[PDB]
DNA sequence: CATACTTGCCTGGGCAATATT
DNA sequence: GAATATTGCCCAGGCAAGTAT
């Protein structure tokens, strides 16, 4: 008797889907020497253009110290630069460098929609949309 | 300005945040027993198998073998799991639950019950949940 | 005092060598 | 040769204590 599937039938399922997505995404991003997490953060910064670590934390749903070390790694890889914040002397601003935008465009052009297709190759557009709706309805 | 990430994987942030919520909830439910969600999961698998090799356990958990080795080390140091020489393989190891491991496992089972499945699926109907699972399994390899 | 990092310690997973058999 | 651990080096997140403004 599987105690875990008795308590949370969804649990293993959600976990495994998330894992599949992570593995696939990493495989696709692999030839450009960037990870899925790093790429995700780069995309968020790219959305905001300019953003503070706390708001970035809000967007990614992640711990602030974790994001700090992430930003350290991103800076050392020359994808991200830290700027002073004209509105606050204790905070900083985070923005993409030229290389950041570069590798974002490289990721976009390389991966395209191949990943989205492979991940949902067993589903139809209606099934994908329904899955999306249900999933977001799970969100509090 | 537009989301490149969301453009490439429309379900990415969504599955991630759902899974994260699930994990945070399960961790908060298991708080007083001083056992994490992952640890409890491995304890469950070992419990079902009764006896199991780390390779088979790796396949049933879908986790790296080395990571699993370290997890098993943690579970041993907390006196929940024991390793023993595998009588059917000279190079293998069998893993099993200690009495305390099975005890805290049962403690968890009785503690959380269906509260987690309930709180996670409260915004859904019965067959909304059923459909959700169906689709989720069909996605899986 | 309140906020924004910042760092340290911990669990945890992925990948890459090792023995061991 | 092939499969089974085990270990080391990474990246990565949660948590808490400390720092800066």
UniProtKB/Swiss-Prot annotation, chain A:
Keywords, ordered alphabetically: Antibiotic resistance, DNA-binding, Repressor, Transcription, Transcription regulation
Residues that span the membrane, as ranges: none
Segments forming domain HTH marR-type: 7-140
Any one biological process term the GO annotation gives: response to heat
PROSITE patterns on file: HTH_MARR_1, HTH_MARR_2
One MF term in the entry's GO annotations: DNA-binding transcription factor activity
Effect listed in the UniProt record for changing residue 41 to E: Increased transcription of the region II transcript
Domain of life: Bacteria
Physiological role: Repressor of the marRAB operon which is involved in the activation of both antibiotic resistance and oxidative stress genes. Binds to the marO operator/promoter site.
Protein name, UniProt field: Multiple antibiotic resistance protein MarR
Organism of this sequence: Escherichia coli (strain K12)
Lineage: Bacteria, Pseudomonadati, Pseudomonadota, Gammaproteobacteria, Enterobacterales
Gene: marR
């Amino acid at each position: 008797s599987d105690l875990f599937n008795e308590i949370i039938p969804l649990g293993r399922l959600i976990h495994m889907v998330n894992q599949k997505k992570d593995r696939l995404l990493n495989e696709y991003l692999s030839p450009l020497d960037i990870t899925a997490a790093q790429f995700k953060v780069l995309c968020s910064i790219r959305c905001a253009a300019c953003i503070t670590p706390v708001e970035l934390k809000k967007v990614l749903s992640v711990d602030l110290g974790a994001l700090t070390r992430m930003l350290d790694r991103l800076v050392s890889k020359g994808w991200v630069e830290r700027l002073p914040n004209p509105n606050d002397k204790r905070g900083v601003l985070v923005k993409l460098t030229t290389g950041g935008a570069a590798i974002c465009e490289q990721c976009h052009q390389l991966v395209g929609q191949d990943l989205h297709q492979e991940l949902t190759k067993n589903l139809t557009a209606d099934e994908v949309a329904t899955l999306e709706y249900l999933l977001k309805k799970v969100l509090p």
